[PDB]
Design a protein around this ligand. Structure first.
Ligand SMILES: [Co+2]
Ligand SMILES: [Co+2]
Ligand code: NA
Lengths: 354, 355
């Protein structure tokens, strides 16, 4: 989307460079897309950002992309390459020019924090010591500023349009993939550039849709939507009842509703998440759903659908965080019962955004 | 509709176990989705497959998912976990139960081959030595069987339907995201479960669509489609002329056409990819497009949109029954990334265009 004043992204770079100097980091190689967006202000495929502790950062893009990138970003130092060897050779030159011996790398769970590029980084920089900086980059992103919240608020409205389309089209006989295709179209036509949609007619925790799984009469359909505005996501999930469900499903839905009321009021500023996770586990145990419980009731939301604090020294709920509750489904043979929303953690209160 | 004969996945697992024993690898942890599908026969999110060199493999899934996975896969040993700690505790138990000293990990470029899971693996398994097995897993997938080719042929037909929608809606004033939304929907309505669509009105090599980039009059729009059937992909890319292009665009498209004639004729059984890549590099240079050239004219396609053999990333030679995308690399001019890509089946002495 590129929207947003350039002043917010430059001060992030300054504060991030300060954080690198606090941990004796000479330079940082940012290869994750979300942090690349956080520091450069724009999404660019194959994200390659070199951040020295002292000096100006440099972005590496493909030949012919320098001008297009400069229109969307405040960064002026842009180097163009035609082969991936020139990419890596350009990075080792900025490392050896800056005399950087300790370089920070994000050990994250997104592109391009892949093992191949990590093994390639160590061999072409055989002398360098790598340091994990995921705690640094996310430690800033856990607490959102006012502009980031406005992006999430608009994404929450986009998610409501996609969930409205879902509620209107879910009929017996339609496949998970056919339903998801209509949700995707609604999200993308409203400005979302990288949405993800789950549709489950069977109990699946990460239920990317299948073509041959159709909705049945007297069943339930669970829709999970993660949609973005200005690259900031908002998450909401609903379990739709089709016809008349059986007594196990109606019980599962009722227990989940009470579990949501517990997690919402118990998630306040200052309490750790594991303090809430302990109460949800015991609650499902008393109601005979111990074998259906899952750990990880919430997670951070921002430039990623799932970002720290995530379960996959106990971090406590802090102001201006964005959390998804409840993230974990109740797994019964009829489906994964979910009811998830995006909440803004305010001064000892949770504002529902979706 | 058949997700694949289960005998095909059982013989793949056995052959993969044999490769582990040939290289003195005690066990392999498969965390990449494409290899998980290749060996288990089904797509399951958060792929977690433990393959011992001798014995039966084990799949880890979420509690309540065991019965569905066993219906979709030939694998019988499925372990359920409720917290991520138990998942890791289950992996380290299978390693010491098997007495494994060297464990293979795929150092790939797809989920879930992420740095975090590697940092966690050596941390929770400090005694184990990790070895790269990406050359092993890809080496099997490089040569397709008859069933794999049948899936790619069907996905190529699906790719044609999405490109037909693209040509019919591309008008000045439409955004890249709006065009991509109609392409994505059409691909999914034909059975594709994880398609990817690039739409570029500006020169971008990996052009995921933006909401605020609109189609211009007297411009060009490049559409790249990677769409799947039974998880096997087919790739096709077209550069559409909108209105009246300038002489730079007319030359770029014409030079791209001549470059395609070289890549097709020079891609024969037995020749290395860099032997063809060198002829395209010089070709763009003579026509004044050296700053518009990109390395990597082709790549394999299958359970991944881009998979080995690639020349820009082993000196692999072209062999029969491979599937390649030609030409993958665009010509980068300020008006756009000029692309013409199709999916070809490498035959004895001919390339059959599937898209
Ligand atoms: Co969630
Ligand atoms: Co390609
Ligand atoms: Na089975």
């Amino acid at each position: 989307g590129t929207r947003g004043n350039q002043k917010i992204f430059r001060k992030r770079m300054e504060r991030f460079q300060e954080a690198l100097k606090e941990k004796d980091i000479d330079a940082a190689v940012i290869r994750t897309l979300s942090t690349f967006i956080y520091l450069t202000g724009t999404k660019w495929l194959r994200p390659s950002l070199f951040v020295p502790a002292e000096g100006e950062p440099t972005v590496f893009v493909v030949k012919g992309e320098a001008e297009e990138f400069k229109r969307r970003s405040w960064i002026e130092n842009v180097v163009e390459f035609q082969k991936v060897e020139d990419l890596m050779a350009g990075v080792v030159k900025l490392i050896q020019s800056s005399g950087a011996r300790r370089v920070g790398l994000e050990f994250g769970v997104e592109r391009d924090a892949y093992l191949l590029f990590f093994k390639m980084f160590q061999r072409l920089n055989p002398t360098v010591e790598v340091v994990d900086i995921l705690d640094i980059t996310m430690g800033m992103r856990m607490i959102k500023d006012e502009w980031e919240i406005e992006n999430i608020r608009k994404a929450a409205k986009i998610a409501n349009k996609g969930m409205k389309v879902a509620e209107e089209i879910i009929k017996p006989g339609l496949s998970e993939l056919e339903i998801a295709a209509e949700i995707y179209r609604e999200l993308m036509l409203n400005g979302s550039e990288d949405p993800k949609v789950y549709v489950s007619t069977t109990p699946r925790a990460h239920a990317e849709p299948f073509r041959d799984l159709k909705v049945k009469e007297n069943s339930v359909v669970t829709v999970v939507i993660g949609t973005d505005w200005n690259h900031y996501y908002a998450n909401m999930a609903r379990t739709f009842v089709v016809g008349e469900p059986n007594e196990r499903v109606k019980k599962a839905i009722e227990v989940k509703e009470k579990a949501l009321e517990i997690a919402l009021e118990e998630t306040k500023v200052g309490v750790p998440l594991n303090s809430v996770e302990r109460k949800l586990f015991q609650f499902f145990k008393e109601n005979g759903f111990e074998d259906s419980y899952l750990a990880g009731y919430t997670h951070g939301v921002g430039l990623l659908i799932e970002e720290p604090p995530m379960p996959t020294r106990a971090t406590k709920v802090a102001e201006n965080m964005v959390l998804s509750i409840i993230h974990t489904p109740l797994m019964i043979p009829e489906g994964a019962i979910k009811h998830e929303d995006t909440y803004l953690v305010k001064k000892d209160e949770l504002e529902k955004l979706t």
